[PDB]
Amino acid sequence: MGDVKNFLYAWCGKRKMTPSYEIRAVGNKNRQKFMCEVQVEGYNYTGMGNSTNKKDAQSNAARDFVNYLVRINEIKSEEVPAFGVA
RNA sequence: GCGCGCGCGC
RNA sequence: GCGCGCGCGC
């Protein structure tokens, strides 16, 4: 979803912190790729994302991260609008 | 989104 | 001119 970044952002706003994205350019100058890593304080994991543009490199890293929060039972899937259970 | 400028390719 | 990206001003 577009909104996962916004979700992760809010999620951290509660435990009163910000995520931290770090993007680096990668691959084909003429058809290029970007690499993203997100971290959050107090969490032992780096969400990783690749894409053509930066936004999507970020979305992908965030998805990665949230998915992990769920795996480690810090969120329920059911609480992540993007992971649309319905 | 609209504008501008930049890189790479063709 | 076209394509993929990046950045900047509204």
Side-chain angles (χ1 to χ4, degrees):
Chain A
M1 186 87 91
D3 308 332
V4 212
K5 280 178 282 183
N6 190 254
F7 170 96
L8 171 59
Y9 193 81
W11 187 84
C12 306
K14 293 190 223 157
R15 14 256 128 170
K16 297 189 195 152
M17 39 184 58
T18 72
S20 48
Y21 292 81
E22 160 142 285
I23 337 206
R24 57 176 155 181
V26 123
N28 279 319
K29 38 207 66 176
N30 70 307
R31 256 196 150 196
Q32 228 211 328
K33 308 285 181 58
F34 296 91
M35 146 80 63
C36 197
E37 311 196 354
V38 224
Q39 286 169 345
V40 175
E41 201 170 327
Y43 291 92
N44 191 25
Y45 190 84
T46 307
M48 302 192 307
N50 311 298
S51 211
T52 318
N53 61 266
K54 295 183 150 168
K55 291 202 175 158
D56 300 356
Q58 272 169 278
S59 306
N60 296 356
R63 204 216 354 106
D64 196 42
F65 203 81
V66 177
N67 179 278
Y68 156 77
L69 296 167
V70 167
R71 185 152 211 267
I72 222 167
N73 306 235
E74 280 263 287
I75 325 178
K76 306 192 197 174
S77 300
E78 336 285 46
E79 328 256 352
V80 182
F83 304 171
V85 274

